[PDB]
Every structure is written in C-alpha cells, then in structure tokens.
Amino acid sequence: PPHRPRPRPLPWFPPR
Amino acid sequence: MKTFTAKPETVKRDWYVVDATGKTLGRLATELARRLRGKHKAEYTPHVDTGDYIIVLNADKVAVTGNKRTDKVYYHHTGHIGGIKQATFEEMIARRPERVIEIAVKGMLPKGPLGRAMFRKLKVYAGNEHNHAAQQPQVLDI
C-alpha cells in the first residue's frame, strides 16, 4: 500500500 | 647523517637482453619485475626508478604449466555495457604474444606513476631479433 501522502502545498509566510 | 637516497639524474641504468624461450611465464615475470624496479641494487630507493632496461626476446615461446595454455583466461571490459571480453592464453599467443609477458609483468609492478615509468623500460619482442644494438645489451640468464 502507499507509504506516503500525495505531495501538497505549504501556507504562505512573509519571506526574507 | 641521513640515509642515502638515489637521485634520478645520477642513477645508472644498464641494458639487458633475456630469451623467454621455454621459461615459465610467472617465474620469468618476477625476475623481470625485480630488475625493472631495481630491487637487485643496493641503491634501491622506493620513490626513484633505479631499475634496468630489459629486452625480452621470443615472447611467443614462453611456457606455462598444467592446462594453462588452453585454460588460462584473460578478461577485459571495454567500458561499454555487456562489453566483457575474454581470450585464452593460446589465443593471446597467436594474436599478440608480447601482451602475455607485458600483462604478467605489469601486474607485478607498483601501481602509480613510478610503476608506469618502470614498465616503459621493458621491451618485449615476439621473435629473436631486436633493434637495440646501439644500446649494447648484455645477455641476462633468468
């Protein structure tokens, strides 16, 4: 069976 | 007072000629490797080539014991996938007899630049003639 979830995105954070 | 070290620019290298006829390959090769390295000289220095130039005649008539003549296999890989090639001692002697001695000796010499330099001093001929009269090689019985 699958051992990983299908890839997803992260929420936006103030980048720098 | 430091231990003596041979110097590449002052080391004396002589020329020898050996007849391979009927000699056992491996037992000839060890003596060649010894002399190419200069292990027979008191000035032996591991980082200097103090050995001698050696001509080997009649490489095509070198001997092997047992069933090696038909059963000793030489392998090489071309570097292409599936490119394992092979040749028996017999096939090698027919196609390129000089390679048999050269291969045996190369495997008994140090690996690295110095060992490659040492091997350049071996001159192997299939027949009984060479073109090094100018170097005046002395006969060497091995």
Partner: protein, 50 residues
Amino acid sequence: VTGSGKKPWRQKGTGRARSGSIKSPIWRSGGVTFAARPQDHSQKVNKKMY
C-alpha cells in the same frame, strides 16, 4: 527589554530556526541571560577578627 511578546514567525514551515521572542538572549538587542541586579558586597567580620 522593550518589545512585544509576539512570536517572530510560526513554529514550523518557514525553514528558519525556531524563535519565540525578539527578546531572547541569543538575539542582537535581546536580554542579558543572567542580568545583574544591584548587589550588596559587604562581608561580615567577626568583632574579634577585626
């Protein structure tokens, strides 16, 4: 140290070391780990030793 108790960035996801306070002693402008207070240095001397 003057400044708010706001967490500089969220605990996970940003790829930065975790931070809790702009006032951490690890940070430039942060607190002193073991900040001095006014101290009394006087020692007792037994009358007879004096």
